């Protein structure tokens, strides 16, 4: 069901031919999500899943791509009868969006591993009858486009996907699952999740994609991993070129995570004449502040990781402090575990390892060490303050004694004379938001940190052992 204009670049014989196809679609009224996802999935299959016989690039012949496209459009058109679901106003109904979601869902293999790589694209849906969680939402949006439902768009948080539709684009619908052993809400709005102030729904400051941002999503969804220790250079290159195409056209302006992904690719292999990784990380953070009320966590995590990899201790700590200053205004809810895992790993593994190395390099005579900078100690404390404030008012606790051992260790990496330099001011100077950290303030400047008292203050524990 492709138009003649869409077929003139085939066969696609290189990365650059795939880029030309994406450029041509992005210059159309609406880019064809089904075409583009089939092409990416095809090239990913033969560059990452099965490279047998590869000599340069897996040539994408029009006959192959058109046949896959026709299997998809046939399946959706045959199963979704639009006359049953009248469309006033160029707006779709909830029943129609649920029907499309049901068609995709009911097409999937009954039993498979949902955490596998390379099951994100419509190539995987057609050839393997397998999709990952977010891949189901994308497929629902692709199918809706194939049906002419111009109002159906992808909605994205930092860990979930759904759709928006309807009068003025204001309706939301769940179309896929989230997590594992979680309870399916397909068909429902996202309003309870927004109202609960969970991270998963971003207090409503989630991405509402247009078709060009949906193209960006598919590009971010490229998975170059061949296995746990090898990536496809071709797919890394393709992703990187496609992200720059999107960037140049303005389609990453409202997509912080994509700017972070691009920055990460530039760190690995910089493109001459382009902005440095740091510039791109800061663009991502600016996009979150401009469009999403500064309510996103990953722009700062992206930044912090870059600094961590480059052993920039000061700037890593600053960026993780900023991560925590975002999370403090959320409630920790039942399906937010991925972000809990992220903060846990930063607090309890990554920061400790960084500080351990800094302690060895200080012993070796390093100058300007983060461990001698009271501003760094203030960032450490702001990080914990944000996590403690996150926990306030939440339906489920965050801190436990497992965190306290690392907090004491990390505090102890700064000498008392450095720690004493931070002035904790009530509403370097630091103001605490959390009641836990306010109560901890006197304990933070002792020469020898009182480990048991810190533990008591950080956790729900209020008594010491009887004997």
């Amino acid at each position: 069901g492709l138009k003649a204009a869409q077929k003139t670049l085939f066969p696609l014989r290189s990365i650059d031919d795939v880029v030309r196809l994406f450029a041509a679609e992005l210059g159309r009224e609406e880019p064809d999500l089904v075409l583009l996802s089939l092409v990416l999935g095809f090239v990913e299959h033969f560059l990452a899943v099965n490279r047998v016989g590869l000599t340069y690039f897996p040539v994408a012949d029009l006959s192959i791509i058109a046949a896959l496209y026709a299997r998809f459009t046939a399946q959706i058109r045959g199963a979704v009868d639009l006359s049953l679901y009248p469309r006033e106003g160029g707006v779709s109904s909830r029943e129609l969006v649920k029907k499309v979601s049901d068609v995709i869902w009911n097409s999937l293999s009954r039993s498979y591993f949902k955490d596998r790589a390379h099951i994100q694209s419509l190539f995987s849906f057609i050839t393997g009858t397998k999709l990952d969680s977010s891949g189901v939402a994308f497929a629902v949006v692709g199918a809706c486009q194939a049906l002419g439902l111009r109002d159906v768009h992808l909605a994205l948080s930092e860990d979930h996907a759904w759709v928006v539709f309807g009068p003025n684009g204001e309706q939301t619908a769940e179309v896929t699952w989230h997590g594992k052993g979680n309870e399916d809400r397909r068909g429902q709005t996202v309003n309870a999740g927004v109202a609960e102030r969970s991270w998963l729904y971003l207090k409503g400051s989630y991405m509402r994609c247009d078709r060009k941002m949906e193209v960006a999503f598919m590009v971010c969804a490229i998975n170059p991993s061949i296995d746990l220790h090898t990536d496809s250079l071709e797919l890394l290159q393709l992703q990187q070129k496609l992200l720059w195409l999107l960037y140049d056209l303005g389609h990453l302006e409202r997509y912080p995570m994509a700017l972070g992904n691009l920055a990460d690719l530039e760190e690995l292999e910089p493109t001459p004449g382009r902005p440095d990784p740091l510039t791109l990380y800061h663009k991502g953070i600016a996009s979150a502040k401009t469009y999403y009320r500064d309510e996103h966590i990953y722009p700062y995590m992206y930044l912090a990781g870059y600094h961590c990899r480059n052993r920039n201790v000061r700037e890593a700590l600053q960026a993780w402090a900023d991560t925590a200053t975002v999370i403090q205004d959320y409630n920790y809810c039942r399906e937010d575990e991925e972000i809990y895992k992220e903060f846990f790993e930063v607090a309890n593994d990554v920061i400790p390892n960084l500080l351990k190395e800094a302690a060895s390099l200080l012993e070796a005579g390093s100058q300007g060490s983060a461990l001698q900078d009271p501003e760094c100690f203030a960032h450490l404390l702001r990080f914990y303050d944000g996590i403690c404030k996150w926990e306030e008012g939440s339906p489920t606790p965050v801190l436990h004694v497992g965190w306290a051992t690392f907090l004491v260790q990390s505090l102890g990496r700064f000498e008392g004379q450095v720690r004493q330099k931070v002035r904790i001011v009530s509403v370097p100077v630091l103001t605490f938001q959390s009641e836990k950290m306010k109560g901890m303030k006197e304990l933070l400047v002792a020469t020898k940190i009182n480990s048991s008292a810190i533990k008591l203050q950080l956790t729900a524990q209020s008594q010491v052992q009887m004997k």
Partner: peptide
């Protein structure tokens, strides 16, 4: 074995 991650989530 290669695994899924949410698209453009940072880290490995």
């Amino acid at each position: 074995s290669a695994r899924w991650r949410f698209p453009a989530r940072p880290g490995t």
